[PDB]
Amino acid sequence: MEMEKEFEQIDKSGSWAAIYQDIRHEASDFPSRVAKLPKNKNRNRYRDVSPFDHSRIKLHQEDNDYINASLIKMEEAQRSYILTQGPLPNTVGHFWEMVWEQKSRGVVMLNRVMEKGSLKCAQYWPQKEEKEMIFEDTNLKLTLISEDIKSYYTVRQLELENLTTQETREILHFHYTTWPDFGVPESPASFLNFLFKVRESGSLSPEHGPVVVHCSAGIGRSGTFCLADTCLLLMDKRKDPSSVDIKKVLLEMRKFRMGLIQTADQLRFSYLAVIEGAKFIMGD
Ligand SMILES: Cc1ccc(CC(=O)NC[C@@H]2CCCO2)cc1
Secondary structure, eight states, X not given: OOHHHHHHHHHHHXXXXXXXXXXXXXXXXXXXXXXXXXXXXXXXXXXXXXXXXGGEEEOSOSSOOEEEEEEEEETTTTEEEEEEOOOOTTTHHHHHHHHHHHTBSEEEEOSOSEETTEEOSOOOSOSSTTSOEEETTTTEEEEEEEEEEOSSEEEEEEEEEETTTTEEEEEEEEEEOOOOSSSOOSOSHHHHHHHHHHHHTTTTSTTSBOEEEESSSSSXXXXXXXXXXXXXXXXXXXXXXXXXXXXXXXXXXXXXXXXXXXXXXHHHHXXXXXXXXXXXXXXX
């Protein structure tokens, strides 16, 4: 069923809450035993958000291999994403270790460091060229190279150096800065513009490791980003773009990380973004 029509039918009926709870009821339940070990309590931002054991990212060290991050692998779309929480004071070094080990080109950030008067994430990147960061726990150095500040997002060029081997790589930081403290944006225009800038960069392409995507918990805004990308890619690839079922794509992605899309408003926003993006890409 053409999603634009399904959309107006849910809107006129006002059944967004009922659709959203049907998804919550049908979603996969897999074990998260590593996340709940007592040695990992200070590696988790929220007690109710854990990566499944089968899909979790492992750090390459014998000590403790645990990070709150999951590999979302979309077989038909031929896209992979790592979804992770906003790093904590004790996990900044683990975060950059994962970026290095997985060969990611891009980091996508969908939150501000402070929102609603509370800290949503650590200040994990350098704000001035001449004041670099050193993560001694993981033996990495991070330097700000350049910064391009626009109305809805900022793009930063970073240099990450493995101090062990003296290898360096360029990492692009895509920071969406205007998601509101409450609710979702009114128009998906600036979010779609942002997604097309990440795509243009090569960060989402198969010649690199998976893009690292985060918000505060790594399931809400982060969920919206990968559901919209994968849905628009499937509409490009298939003979009938109207066969793409956004609820079925979301349940497939929820096999790999729990809780993706946190509210009925985020579900409605995801529909709006896909419906609108399907147009501009090929003038519909
Ligand atoms: C939350 C958090 C924790 C740790 C760090 C790393 C850091 O800034 N370390 C200090 C020296 C001064 C120059 C090189 O690094 C950043 C952010």
